[PDB]
Homo-oligomer: A and B are copies of this chain.
Amino acid sequence: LMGGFGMKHPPPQILIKNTPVPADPPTAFNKDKLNSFITQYSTGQVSVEIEWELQKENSKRWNPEIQYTSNYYKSNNVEFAVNTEGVYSEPRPIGTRYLTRNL
């Protein structure tokens, strides 16, 4: 209902964790689980590659259609670009529905 593709078997969940590294244990045995760990974090890169299938427009419509565009008029910033402070922003929601079909 929020939109998109419903699937019985969607892309699976990808779970990641830093494995705990204990700090120095005591030299006499203790049965309690170790609550003392080395402070730790990880970084890396992720690649996601999705192949998308397209359905072309076959239309016989004579007149030109509505298309999504940028507006030429001068502005302080470029839409869908970085800020003067380095902040990327998305100025507007963009749907998919521009081209037309008969009903």
Binding site for B on A (CB under 8 A): 62-72, 78-81
List the B side residues contacting A67 at CB < 8 Å. 67-69
List the B side residues contacting A71 at CB < 8 Å. 66
Residue of B nearest to A71 (CB): B66
Indicate the member of A63, A71, A78 with the most B CB atoms within 10 Å.
A63
List the B side residues contacting A80 at CB < 8 Å. 62-64
Quote the shortest CB–CB distance from A95 to chain B (angstroms). 13
Q: Please determine whether A70 and B79 come into contact, CB atoms closer than 8 angstroms.
A: no
Quote the shortest CB–CB distance from A102 to chain B (angstroms). 15
Q: Please determine whether A66 and B62 come into contact, CB atoms closer than 8 angstroms.
A: no
List the B side residues contacting A81 at CB < 8 Å. 62-63
List the B side residues contacting A78 at CB < 8 Å. 63
23 of the cross-chain contacts (CB-CB < 8 Å) are: A62-B80, A62-B81, A63-B70, A63-B78, A63-B79, A63-B80, A63-B81, A64-B68, A64-B69, A64-B70, A64-B79, A64-B80, A65-B69, A65-B70, A66-B69, A66-B70, A66-B71, A66-B72, A67-B67, A67-B68, A67-B69, A68-B69, A69-B69
